[PDB]
Write a protein that binds this ligand. Structure first.
Ligand SMILES: CCCCCCCCCCCCCCCCCC(=O)OC[C@H](CO[C@@H]1O[C@H](CO[C@H]2O[C@H](CO)[C@H](O)[C@H](O)[C@H]2O)[C@H](O)[C@H](O)[C@H]1O)OC(=O)CCCCCCCCCCCCCCCCC
Ligand code: CLA
Ligand code: CLA
Ligand code: CLA
Ligand code: CLA
Ligand SMILES: CC(C)=CCC/C(C)=C/CC/C(C)=C/CC/C(C)=C/CC/C(C)=C/CC/C(C)=C/CC/C(C)=C/CC/C(C)=C/CC/C(C)=C/CC1=CC(=O)C(C)=C(C)C1=O
Ligand SMILES: CCCCCCCCCCCCCCCC(=O)OC[C@H](CO[C@@H]1O[C@H](CS(=O)(=O)O)[C@@H](O)[C@H](O)[C@H]1O)OC(=O)CCCCCCCCCCCCCCC
Ligand SMILES: CCCCCCCCCCCCCCCC(=O)OC[C@H](COP(=O)(O)OC[C@@H](O)CO)OC(=O)CCCCCCCCCCCCCCC
Ligand SMILES: CCCCCCCCCCCCCCCC(=O)OC[C@H](COP(=O)(O)OC[C@@H](O)CO)OC(=O)CCCCCCCCCCCCCCC
Ligand SMILES: CCCCCCCCCCCCCCCC(=O)OC[C@H](COP(=O)(O)OC[C@@H](O)CO)OC(=O)CCCCCCCCCCCCCCC
Ligand SMILES: CC1=C(/C=C/C(C)=C/C=C/C(C)=C/C=C/C=C(C)/C=C/C=C(C)/C=C/C2=C(C)CCCC2(C)C)C(C)(C)CCC1
Ligand code: OEX
Ligand SMILES: [Cl-]
Ligand SMILES: [Cl-]
Ligand SMILES: [Fe+3]
Lengths: 32, 63, 29, 34, 170, 52, 36, 37, 82, 51, 333, 33, 340, 34, 32, 36
């Protein structure tokens, strides 16, 4: 299938960036 | 700690910690096998290296 | 897109310099 | 018994000679391109 | 991970977390020998298994065929499939014997102290050592080629091009 | 596997060192006797029972 | 002098689970459209 | 058969054994002579 | 540091007995080395070609070893055609 | 020309190093700390922190 | 007393970054060279370096990556001529002829020279000893050699080291084919300086780390055994010397930390000084040792050595480098 | 002081052949093709 | 016990420590050094490379070498009693037997030395970080002198033990491998040059932040090994570099660990890259630029220029550098620029 | 061959001369050790 | 320039993943 | 019952800066080879 080549990175960054944000906040909350 | 049915069975297998043989024990016997294994590796090495060429042993894709 | 990637990394490094100098961990005696 | 500065000077003199001989052999005989 | 505090990991007298590494070695070595033996004796021979990939010297008619063990000196010729079978059988037996030995006979007092057999990190060190030894070997047999690295599966070698191995046959 | 093997040689050395010098990997003895590391003092290097 | 308006930031385990679920589901939903 | 290659291998074995043999035989001898007080 | 126990190099090389011994031993080893070359023994021991032993009178072809196991005889047949 | 150019460039460079060496030390010697820092009067210790 | 207030801030020791009078020149020049470099490395058009109307692309936007990217040296047609922007009819001409290259390196060499002086200045303001700048003279001379001195001796800034990774390699290869820098005793001292430097750096680092006095446990870093500004030394030089003194022999080891550290400074600096002078002297074509056809047999046949093999490699670079720039059999410029 | 020690051997193993080698190379400077 | 008696003697405090590691180190190292000195003085390379490589033949210090065995030998151990030399010492040298002699004994020498480092460190009472650091020279020696020729056709393409011979090895790796374009060498360069930087900048800083512990102008006398105080001001040294460079060391222990890390890591990285070259797995090209340049005869970078240089190196040195290939290049096939 | 004796001759004389100059000092060291 | 289509995503992950790992570790340290 | 072998993990600001630098520079170096 001839899909959008930027679709892969767009999807990956769509997941990683906000997920990391939540992981950062969580781990630093437990360490308090 | 917790007791389990599989733990009780395996218990003797992990009950001799730190237990050793007095002095050198079987150290010389170990050295003999270490010597023979060194000779063994040296043999098969030179066979592949063709430093050791034996009758009936053609180190090649042809065999 | 290659250029943008190369420049972006370079930009991040320069930014890192700024924080490692002016917002470093202050050495105390 | 023998002054150390003398031993060092003689040995040093011997070094310069044997080194100079090698640099001499660079322009004569084998490896002289001639 | 949840049930980490098992009684088996505790030393009967001290109550400290302890592992009898010398006997563990004997047990696991006994297992390795059995599996090693069984692999060569059944799987490779075709006695109870498919065998292994074998082919002509030019890799034209390769297939999975049962292999009979080579017990002569030619069994150390690594382009002989029969050597691989004979190896796992013979070394399999040795592993079983050594396994039993390393179970029944306690380590000498000096070797225990010299090799720190109470510290599990001494096992990591020696295991890693044996691991790169095996890693260097499989890299060598792959590049130079052997009966375990058929050219129909992994491709030809550079030394076959160097010697014009296929041009002479053609 | 050739790269990994060479890399694991360091693993052998590192974890190997960690095993033999375990007592001093958090730092050497706070007041190590100079005499121990100074020459001529001992007949055998490190052996306290070999002072001349 | 330190700023007196600084507050600690929190995010309990539950909110982490809720967030990751929100992100992954949105990702599963929009990924097909990103690939188009 | 004892091929010329195999003949040399045993020569290499004996040569190495003698070298290691004479080495340790000397070192052990010296160690017994000049013991540590 | 202290001192390990051996005799200090300083006093030995400044001693007379040393230079009595080494005014003979050192030059003899030097002369021995000289004789090892001047006699031409070095050439035959290591097989290093003499200035007139690289080529024959009409060859520039390098006597290069092409075989592995018959390499000894291959070198010997090179020495023969000289 | 090659002999004269190379030789004097070498000398010129080292004399610049000689300038830097003897000049800096002259400054320090005249100020009074060419032999090191006074332990009981270290200038930095009397200075404020950079951050 | 108004100009005095300016002087006090310039020479102030309470600035996060020291300015100083050397810095008064350093800061603008370095900023000028840096800004121009970043722009040129990314968006500059191709440059006719060899002055033969054969433009060489060096920027990212014109088909380069980080490895192949470079700011290309000024045209050979220019030579040693000063070529600022206001000497060109247009920026387009200026860019075509390698304008940015001269602008950057000149602002850089000036800035770098002031950087060295700036090092003396702060050390004087703090009551230090002033020879750290002398150590920095070793890499600074090296930069002067490839950016300024070598173009002078050769007669063109087109033969200067390009501001790029691959361009650097191009500089090294062509250099070897024309000067035989490998067979030059000054590069060999440079190699001994940087290999030895790395060795001694690894050496000093390992011995001090090994002799660290235990102040921490196994569940924390050993670095926390040291506190910034503490009176006591963090390691035991006595133990360290005891080790290295037995690794070889005691008189081959340092018991003096000042004498040891001086050696640590002396060895790589002196080494780099020589390889700096190497480029500087080979700039006037005093090239490396030439032993081509040095060994001759009785009849007269040339008996090749490893030097003759090196020569064959040098021939390969020579006949191919700048394949269109030569019209005559001898490569002089 | 002891005359023949471990250091003694360590010296002469490098010492003796060096002078022998130096003499050899010294003679090589007079070799003509 | 005899073992304990021998252990006492081996670990005696002497001018030259021996230890158990000495039984392996000292003989192997002596043969490696002696073998090289012997070969570069008398032994030739006329039958293996077609080259002179000894003082006896007229070579100087820069050109002498112990050359690699002929390509026809393959990866043979070339033992003196081996099937190639067959006990003949003279033939053994002529075949290149001294190269393997040095390489192999030199390898076990390096093992003995690293062991020596462990042994002494255990007796003294210090951490073995010196032995750990020495893993980097070993990784380099192994990859270059052992693994790389093993990956290739024979020992012939390994480095020959000589000054100019090494220079050959350098230029070979440029023309054939484009070794400069490899990121693993680049990290090695950064480690070596970075190590030299750290070495210079640390010694200079310490020497120029010294405390005044004497009245003499030469400050070397103002130190004592048994002193408990620091000889230089870490505080003053920190402020200096903080204002000059922007950042500075604040922890002595991290400083000297970092001084270990940089050059050791660099050498290990360069070692990995050599392993790749053993299989001709090079960072030779960028496909993106080759596609462009092949379609556009007006596209040129410093990268495409260097490849032209490599092409020149290969075609011009190969016939003599690889005499076993019997390469014959007519003048008209040689890649040449104009005039030259 | 005769060339061997020529080369080893200075070595033998050197060793011999050294022995007789160190012999009374050498064997005493072995007296003390034994 | 006809470059690899995975070059972008491979470079992005090579930066993001280990750098995120570090950021996470840092924030939970300052919170301690 | 809790596990007594658990330990807190730390990474100071300096290690962060160093680590980020190591990653960013490695990225800048290897990126060209990824794009190829
Ligand atoms: C950590 C460092 C620790 C410290 C260092 C310790 C060093 C100790 C000394 C080590 C010495 C190793 C010697 C290895 C000799 C070798 O390899 O010798 C090579 C031989 C194979 O010989 C070669 O074989 C080739 C292929 O031939 C084959 O193929 C041809 C074409 O068809 C023909 O058919 C021919 O008949 C057939 O034999 C060519 O013939 C070559 O000319 C010939 O030399 O393998 C063999 O001996 C055995 C191969 C299997 C074991 C490999 C382990 C050793 C090597 C590890 C690294 C490998 C790297 C690979 C590349 C990466
Ligand atoms: C650079 C080499 C090197 C070094 C410095 C060390 C250092 C260490 N090893 Mg390791 N080791 C090495 C290589 C090395 N090892 C290799 C290549 C192997 C094989 C896989 C091993 C296998 C190994 C094991 C299994 C163990 C160690 C252990 C140790 C520690 C104790 C010393 C010891 O046992 O030495 C071992 C002895 C040597 C390295 C020298 C061997 C010399 C051989 C016998 C010479 C053979 C010559 C040969 C026959 C000549 C012809 C060859 C030719 C034809 C090719 C120490 C941390 C021990 C440990 O972790 O303790 C806590 C341990 O149990 N090592
Ligand atoms: C094993 C192989 C080997 C080794 C170890 C060396 C080693 C060396 N070579 Mg040689 N070389 C080799 C092979 C080798 N070479 C080969 C095979 C060839 C032939 C192709 C050459 C051709 C060659 C050439 C042509 C040259 C060298 C040079 C050098 C030196 C390079 C380091 C230097 O100049 O530092 C000195 C340090 C610097 C130049 C850095 C200056 C930095 C300035 C002051 C500041 C920069 C700041 C920066 C822009 C921004 C920083 C930002 C930050 C603060 C955030 C060194 C002596 C060079 C040399 O000797 O130069 C004098 C040189 O020109 N080599
Ligand atoms: C620490 C000592 C040491 C070590 C590790 C080595 C290691 C090596 N040497 Mg070196 N060598 C040494 C000392 C050493 N040497 C000394 C002191 C000399 C001067 C006399 C030499 C002279 C020398 C030469 C002239 C040559 C080597 C070569 C070699 C290599 C091959 C060795 C081999 O195959 O051995 C095989 C032997 C063994 C591994 C010993 C095995 C011992 C066990 C216990 C078995 C015992 C068997 C038993 C006694 C039965 C015997 C046989 C019987 C059934 C008939 C190897 C790299 C060769 C080389 O480099 O070629 C390129 C070569 O030609 N060495
Ligand atoms: C700026 C220039 C520069 C620099 C700094 C480097 C730096 C480096 N290059 Mg590179 N290189 C360069 C330019 C440069 N190169 C260029 C332009 C080319 C042309 C393409 C090359 C070609 C090149 C090659 C072909 C190789 C390197 C390698 C290396 C590494 C060598 C490490 C070392 O010390 O090994 C030295 C060797 C050791 C440390 C091994 C152990 C040695 C023992 C300890 C010796 C003991 C001797 C004993 C005491 C007795 C001696 C006696 C005798 C002296 C008489 C290092 C990362 C090597 C590499 O990557 O190796 C992995 C390699 O093979 N370079
Ligand atoms: C516009 C665009 C795109 C521009 C980009 C152009 C371009 C060319 C980009 C490329 C950029 C670039 C850097 C490419 C190189 C890539 C590369 C080689 C990466 C390799 C990375 C890597 C993994 C290497 C492995 C080996 C390794 C870890 C090397 C480390 C090297 C390193 C960190 C060296 C640091 C040396 C250094 C700066 C030391 C100074 C430290 C300092 C200030 C100490 C001060 C100091 C000293 C004292 O003594 C005391 C006592 C105190 C108290 C004190 O404070
Ligand atoms: C090619 C095949 C090779 C096979 C192997 C052959 C070589 C094997 C290794 C031999 C190594 C010998 C090293 C010592 C040599 C020496 O000078 O002897 C010194 C010793 C001890 O001297 C004593 O020396 C002592 C110090 S120390 O032991 O020398 O460190 C000192 O305390 C004491 O006063 C003094 O009397 O003298 C003897 O033991 C007599 C026998 C010497 C042989
Ligand atoms: C340019 C750079 C751009 C970077 C953008 C980064 C954005 C990061 C923030 C966005 C994500 C935040 C998510 C927080 C998520 C979160 O933490 O929720 C928890 C939060 C409740 O907060 P509390 O008052 O309990 O706060 C307690 C503290 O621990 C919180 O800090 O609810 C909300 O914030 C409102 C929105 C809830 C939405 C949750 C609904 C999810 C339902 C499942 C959906 C999927 C299934 C669908 C099935 C059909
Ligand atoms: C060039 C290299 C320079 C090195 C440092 C020079 C110090 C320069 C220095 O300041 O030395 C000064 C020192 C002066 O010693 P003294 O005359 O005061 O006497 C003290 C000694 O004799 C011990 O009693 O001279 C020596 O020790 C020379 C020793 C040579 C011994 C050679 C023996 C070699 C044995 C083999 C090598 C062992 C290596 C072990 C690991 C493999
Ligand atoms: C006298 C010869 C000088 C040669 C040039 C200088 C080289 C050494 C200085 C390098 C500067 C490093 C950066 C500053 C490092 C730094 O700050 O050093 C600090 C160090 C400490 O000395 P002091 O401050 O106690 O004394 C300085 C004056 O006040 C005199 O007492 O200075 C010296 O040791 C000077 C040594 C002069 C003698 C050095 C001779 C070395 C070269 C010998 C020939 C080698 C040729 C090799 C050919 C292959
Ligand atoms: C091979 C072999 C072997 C071995 C042998 C040997 C071990 C030998 C040795 C030999 C030797 C051991 C030799 C030596 C030599 C030395 C020399 C030859 C030296 C020289 C020196 C010089 C030349 C110097 C120079 C200089 C310097 C460096 C300083 C500065 C200045 C001058 C220039 C003075 C055997 C029989 C076992 C077995 C068989 C095989
Ligand atoms: O421009 Mn750049 O490189 Ca100095 O040489 Mn002539 O010119 Mn061109 O050829 Mn070769
Ligand atoms: Cl070019
Ligand atoms: Cl022209
Ligand atoms: Fe230091």
């Amino acid at each position: 299938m001839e899909v959008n080549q930027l679709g892969l990175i767009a999807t990956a960054l769509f997941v990683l960036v906000p997920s990391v944000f939540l992981i950062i906040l969580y781990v630093q909350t437990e360490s308090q | 700690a917790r007791r389990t049915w599989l733990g009780d069975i395996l218990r003797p297998l992990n009950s001799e910690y730190g237990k050793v043989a007095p002095g050198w024990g079987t150290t010389p016997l170990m050295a003999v096998f270490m010597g023979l294994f060194l000779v063994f590796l040296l043999i098969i090495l030179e066979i592949y290296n063709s430093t050791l060429i034996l009758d009936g042993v053609n180190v090649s894709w042809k065999a | 897109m290659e250029t943008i990637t190369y420049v972006f990394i370079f930009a991040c490094i320069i930014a890192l310099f700024f924080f490692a100098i002016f917002f470093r961990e202050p050495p105390r005696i | 018994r023998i002054p150390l500065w003398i031993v060092a000077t003689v040995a040093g003199m011997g070094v310069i000679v044997i080194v100079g001989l090698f640099f001499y052999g660079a322009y004569a005989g084998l490896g002289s391109s001639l | 991970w949840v049930y980490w505090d098992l009684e088996l990991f505790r030393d009967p007298r001290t109550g400290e977390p302890a592992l009898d590494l010398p006997k563990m070695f004997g047990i696991h070595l006994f297992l390795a020998g059995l599996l090693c033996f069984g692999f060569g004796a059944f799987h490779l021979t075709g006695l109870f298994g498919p065998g292994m990939w074998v082919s002509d010297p030019y890799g034209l008619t390769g297939s999975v065929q049962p292999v009979a063990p080579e017990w002569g000196p030619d069994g150390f010729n690594p382009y002989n499939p029969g050597g691989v079978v004979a190896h796992h059988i013979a070394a399999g037996i040795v592993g079983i014997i050594a396994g039993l030995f390393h179970i029944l006979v306690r380590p000498p007092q000096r070797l225990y102290k010299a090799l720190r057999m109470g510290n599990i990190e001494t096992v990591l060190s020696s295991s890693i050592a044996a691991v790169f030894f095996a890693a260097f070997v499989v890299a060598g047999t792959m590049w130079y080629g052997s009966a375990t690295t058929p050219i129909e599966l992994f491709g030809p070698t550079r030394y076959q091009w160097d010697s014009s191995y296929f041009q002479q046959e053609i | 596997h050739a790269v990994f093997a060479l890399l694991f040689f360091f693993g052998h050395i590192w974890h190997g060192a960690r095993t033999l010098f375990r007592d001093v990997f958090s730092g050497i003895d706070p007041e190590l006797s100079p005499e121990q590391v100074e020459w001529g003092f001992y007949q055998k290097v490190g052996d306290v029972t070999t002072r001349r | 002098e330190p700023n007196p308006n600084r507050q600690p930031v929190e995010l309990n385990r539950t909110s982490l689970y809720l967030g990751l679920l929100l992100i992954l589901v949105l990702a599963l939903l929009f990924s097909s459209y990103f690939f188009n | 058969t004892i091929t010329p290659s195999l003949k040399g291998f045993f020569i290499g074995l004996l040569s190495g054994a003698v070298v290691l043999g004479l080495t340790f035989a000397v070192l052990i001898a010296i160690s017994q002579i000049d013991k540590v007080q | 540091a202290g001192t390990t126990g051996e005799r200090p190099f300083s006093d030995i090389i400044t001693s007379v007995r040393y230079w009595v011994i080494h005014s003979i031993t050192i030059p003899a080893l030097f002369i021995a080395g000289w004789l090892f070359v001047s006699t031409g023994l070095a050439y035959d021991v290591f097989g290093t070609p003499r200035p007139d032993s690289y080529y024959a009178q009409e060859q520039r072809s390098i006597p290069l070893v092409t075989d592995r196991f018959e390499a000894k005889q291959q070198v010997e047949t090179f020495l023969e055609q000289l | 020309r090659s002999w004269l150019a190379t030789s004097h460039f070498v000398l010129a460079f080292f004399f610049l190093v000689g300038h830097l060496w003897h000049a800096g030390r002259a400054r320090a010697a005249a100020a009074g700390f060419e032999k090191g820092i006074d332990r009981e009067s270290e200038p930095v210790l009397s200075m404020p922190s950079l951050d | 007393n108004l100009w005095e207030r300016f002087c006090n801030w310039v020479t102030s020791t309470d600035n996060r970054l020291y300015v100083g009078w050397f810095g008064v020149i350093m800061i603008p020049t370095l900023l000028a060279a840096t800004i121009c470099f970043v722009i040129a490395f990314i968006a500059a058009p191709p440059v006719d370096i060899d002055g033969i109307r054969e433009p060489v692309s060096g920027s990212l936007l014109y088909g380069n990556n980080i490895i192949t990217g470079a700011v290309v040296p000024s045209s050979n047609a220019i030579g040693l001529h000063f070529y600022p922007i206001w000497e060109a009819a247009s920026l387009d001409e200026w860019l075509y002829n390698g304008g940015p290259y001269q602008l950057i390196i000149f602002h850089f060499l000036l800035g770098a020279s002031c950087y060295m002086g700036r090092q003396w200045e702060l050390s004087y303001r703090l009551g230090m000893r002033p020879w750290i700048c002398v150590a920095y003279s070793a890499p600074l001379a090296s930069a002067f050699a490839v950016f300024l001195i070598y173009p002078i001796g050769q007669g063109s800034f087109s033969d200067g080291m390009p501001l790029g990774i691959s361009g650097t390699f191009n500089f090294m290869i062509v250099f070897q084919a024309e000067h035989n820098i490998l067979m030059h005793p000054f590069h060999q001292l440079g190699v001994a300086g940087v290999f030895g430097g790395a060795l001694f750096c690894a050496m000093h680092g390992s011995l001090v780390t090994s002799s660290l006095i235990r102040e921490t446990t196994e569940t924390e870093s050993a670095n926390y055994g040291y506190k910034f500004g503490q009176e006591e030394e963090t390691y035991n030089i006595v133990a360290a010397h005891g080790y290295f003194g037995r690794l070889i022999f005691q008189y081959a080891s340092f018991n003096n930390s000042r004498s040891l550290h001086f050696f640590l400074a002396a060895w790589p600096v002196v080494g780099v000084w020589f390889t700096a002078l190497g480029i500087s002297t080979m700039a006037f074509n005093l090239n490396g040792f030439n032993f081509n056809h040095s060994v001759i047999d009785a009849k007269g046949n040339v008996i090749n050595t490893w030097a003759d093999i090196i020569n064959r490699a040098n021939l390969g670079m020579e006949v191919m480098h700048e394949r269109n720039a030569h019209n005559f059999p001898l490569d002089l410029a | 002081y002891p005359i023949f020690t471990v250091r003694w051997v360590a010296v002469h193993t490098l010492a003796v052949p060096t002078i022998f080698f130096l003499g050899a190379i010294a003679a090589m400077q007079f070799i003509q093709r | 016990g005899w073992f304990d008696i021998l252990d006492d003697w081996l670990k005696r405090d002497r001018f030259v420590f021996v230890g158990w590691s000495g039984i392996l180190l000292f003989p192997c190292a002596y043969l490696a050094l002696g073998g090289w000195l012997t070969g570069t003085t008398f032994v030739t390379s006329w039958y293996t490379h077609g080259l002179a490589s000894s003082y006896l033949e007229g070579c100087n210090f820069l050109t002498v070498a112990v050359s690699t065995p002929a390509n026809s030998m393959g990866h043979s151990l070339l033992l003196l009693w081996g099937p190639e030399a067959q006990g003949d010492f003279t033939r053994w040298c002529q075949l290149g037997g001294l190269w393997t002699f040095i390489a192999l004994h030199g390898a076990f020498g390096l093992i003995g030395f690293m062991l020596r480092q462990f042994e002494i460190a255990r007796l003294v009472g210090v951490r073995p970080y010196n032995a750990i650091a020495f893993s980097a020279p070993i990784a380099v020696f192994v990859s270059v002198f052992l693994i790389y020729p093993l990956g290739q056709s024979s020992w012939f393409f390994a480095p020959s033990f000589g000054v100019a011979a090494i220079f050959r090895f350098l230029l070979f790796f440029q023309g054939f491998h484009n070794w400069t374009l490899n990121p693993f060498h680049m990290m090695g360069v950064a480690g070596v040059l970075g190590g030299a930087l750290l070495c210079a900048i640390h010694g200079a800083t310490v020497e120029n932040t010294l405390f005044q512990d004497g009245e003499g102008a030469s400050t070397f006398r103002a130190f004592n090994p048994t002193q408990a105080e620091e000889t230089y001001s870490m505080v003053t040294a920190n402020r200096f570099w903080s204002q000059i460079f922007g950042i500075a060391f604040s922890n002595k222990r991290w400083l000297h660990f970092f001084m270990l890390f940089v050059p050791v890591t660099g050498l290990w990285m360069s070692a990995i890259g050599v392993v790749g070259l053993a299989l001709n797995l090079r960072s030779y090209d960028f496909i993106s630029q080759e596609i462009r340049a092949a379609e556009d005869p007006e596209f040129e970078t410093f990268y495409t220029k260097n490849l032209l240089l490599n092409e020149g190196i290969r075609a011009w040195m190969a016939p003599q550098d690889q005499p076993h290939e019997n390469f014959v290049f007519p003048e008209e096939v040689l890649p040449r620029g104009n005039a030259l | 061959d005769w060339r061997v004796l020529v080369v080893l001759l200075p070595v033998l004389l050197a060793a011999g001369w050294a022995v007789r100059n160190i012999l009374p000092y050498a064997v005493k060291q072995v007296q003390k050790l034994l």
